[PDB]
Write a protein that binds this ligand. Structure first.
Ligand SMILES: OC[C@H]1O[C@@H](O[C@H]2[C@H](O)[C@@H](O)[C@H](O)O[C@@H]2CO)[C@H](O)[C@@H](O)[C@H]1O
Length: 138
């Protein structure tokens, strides 16, 4: 097991063909999960499942630049379930991050932050038991 919040260094940043895999279990009465791909203080890609936003489950994605959040991208497919084990895969592609959950494609997020090789940490936080977090090149 891992302690949350967990920091996964991404040496030399991200690059197309880099695949991040996160394994964990959602706690019983979870409120949120967050993945934060950071470029220094900026958040290049924030991926944030919300279990109870006005009694709806939604995933919010965004970018934080100079401490300011940008325009959220939201879609409503919500594959997580409180209490259950999950796998998140984030594949870096030339134009976007591509996210699959439990082997099913979920969403893609276009690169707003262009300096991919400066996106050198992934923070994993929220209401999870975190089993593992790693990367490989495909
Ligand atoms: O955009 C990601 C960012 O959202 C913040 O929450 C927003 C919320 O989504 C929006 O509906 C409301 O109008 O403004 C809030 C503050 O920007 C979260 O606080 C932050 O953690 C990120 O998840």
């Amino acid at each position: 097991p891992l302690i949350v919040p967990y920091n996964l260094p991404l040496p030399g940043g991200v690059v197309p063909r880099m695949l991040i895999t996160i394994l964990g279990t959602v706690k019983p009465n979870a409120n949120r999960i967050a993945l934060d791909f950071q470029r220094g203080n900026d958040v290049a890609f924030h991926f944030n499942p919300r279990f109870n936003e006005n009694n709806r489950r939604v995933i919010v994605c965004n970018t934080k630049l100079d401490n300011n959040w940008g325009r959220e991208e939201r879609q409503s497919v919500f594959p997580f379930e409180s209490g259950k084990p999950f796998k998140i895969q984030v594949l870096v592609e030339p134009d976007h991050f591509k996210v699959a959950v439990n082997d099913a494609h979920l969403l893609q997020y276009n690169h707003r932050v262009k300096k991919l090789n400066e996106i050198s940490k992934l923070g994993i936080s929220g209401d999870i038991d975190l089993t593992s977090a790693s990367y490989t090149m495909i």
